[PDB]
């Protein structure tokens, strides 16, 4: 609507058979864990999801056991918290959305699990929004708890700008510039919204090779069985 | 049902075995001319409605934009 | 010409050649295809 359609970026997965850069997904998961997890939730992504992807079973294991998870009231009606398991999902920031409303000045930070899929031109939007907290121009004035992000609908996103250059340090050491961080978290959120991106593209490559083998051969069989007629010569011979 | 379909008489229909004839006789030899022959018998009936759909679509888009564009004279 | 007379003329053998070939084709296709995908990404 009334917002800049985020400019497309030359993503490493933008191509037709181009997979995701898994180091960028690992860095973006670190960005989410250290910055984005304070307000946003990832209800459909368990720690196991990380396993095999930018993280191993044991890698995720330590990551899962860094946090604590209430494991129910056990058998003594005793709600109790335990270190996370590879089967545990990502922890909630808030127990219910009304606590999110109370803690975020009436705004609800949405599930970031499918944000890229749920936002038109998500990957771009995400990058743009996170990197689009420009100053409101003359004539527009925003109330407290609002920020002029041209890309955000209305240009008034409650979320304050969360990525200040060198906000967090990448374990890999890649300079943590605001952008390098926004690109990594956009790749990660993308991965989140489609953990199968890579596997699929492989299927699609096998499908293109199989169809390139099979279409001319089936066409040749059809043209064999239809040549007979396509050569049929009709002649009218009235006895006259 | 094949048989007792209609009355056909005094006609001779010749044909050849599939394996005896080339699979793609002059496929691009005459195929291209024919496809082109075909396109020129149907292009004037088919294309100009979609041409004016393209003009109406663009027009609508641009007109809509102008509609959205602020009236400079207004607010001044 | 020999092949036709040997594995493609008797329908039973036709099926045999098809099945056996398919059994191996998967190995080859998967291998070759994977090579390509990996090279691409």
């Amino acid at each position: 609507d009334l917002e800049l359609h985020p400019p497309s970026y030359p993503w490493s997965h933008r191509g037709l058979l181009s997979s995701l850069d898994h180091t960028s997904i690992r860095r973006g998961f670190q960005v989410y864990k250290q910055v984005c997890s304070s307000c946003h939730s990832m209800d459909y992504v368990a720690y196991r999801h990380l396993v095999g992807v930018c993280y191993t079973e044991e890698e995720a294991k330590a990551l899962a056991e860094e946090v604590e998870v209430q494991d129910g009231p056990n058998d003594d009606g005793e709600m109790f918290m335990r270190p996370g398991k590879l089967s545990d999902y990502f922890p909630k920031p808030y127990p219910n959305p009304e606590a999110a409303r109370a803690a975020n000045n009436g705004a609800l930070p949405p599930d970031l699990s499918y944000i890229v899929r749920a936002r038109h031109g998500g990957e771009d939007y995400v990058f743009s929004l996170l990197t689009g907290y420009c100053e409101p121009p003359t004539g527009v004035s925003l109330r407290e708890g609002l920020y002029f992000n041209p890309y955000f609908p209305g240009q008034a996103i409650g979320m304050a700008p969360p990525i200040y250059t060198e906000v967090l340090e990448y374990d890999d050491g890649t300079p943590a510039t605001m952008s390098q961080v926004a690109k990594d978290v956009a790749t990660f959120l993308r991965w989140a919204s489609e953990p199968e991106h890579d596997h699929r593209k492989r299927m699609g490559l096998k499908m293109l090779l199989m169809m390139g083998l099979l279409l001319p051969l089936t066409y040749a069989m059809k043209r064999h069985k239809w040549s007979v007629l396509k050569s049929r010569k009709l002649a009218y011979r009235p006895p006259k | 049902e094949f048989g007792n379909l209609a009355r056909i008489r005094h006609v001779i229909s010749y044909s050849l075995s599939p394996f005896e004839q080339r699979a793609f006789p002059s496929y691009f030899s005459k195929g291209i001319p024919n496809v082109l022959r075909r396109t020129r018998e149907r292009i004037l009936r088919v294309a100009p409605p979609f041409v004016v759909v393209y003009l109406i679509y663009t027009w609508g888009n641009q007109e809509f934009e102008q509609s959205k564009r602020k009236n400079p004279a207004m607010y001044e | 010409s020999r092949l036709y007379s040997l594995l493609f003329r008797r329908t039973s053998t036709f099926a045999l050649t098809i099945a056996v070939g398919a059994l191996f084709f998967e190995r080859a296709f998967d291998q070759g295809a994977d090579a390509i995908y990996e090279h691409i990404n």
């Binding site: 010569k233 002649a235 | 010749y14 005896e20 004839q21 080339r22 002059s26 | 010409s1």
Partner: peptide, 24 residues
């Protein structure tokens, strides 16, 4: 009789002799 008329040549369509049949 019918003998008067002759079979049209399909050579144009006709491709390349039992020797060849096996291959064909």
């Amino acid at each position: 009789s019918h003998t008067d008329v002759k079979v049209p040549d399909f050579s144009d369509y006709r491709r390349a002799s039992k020797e060849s049949s096996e291959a064909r």
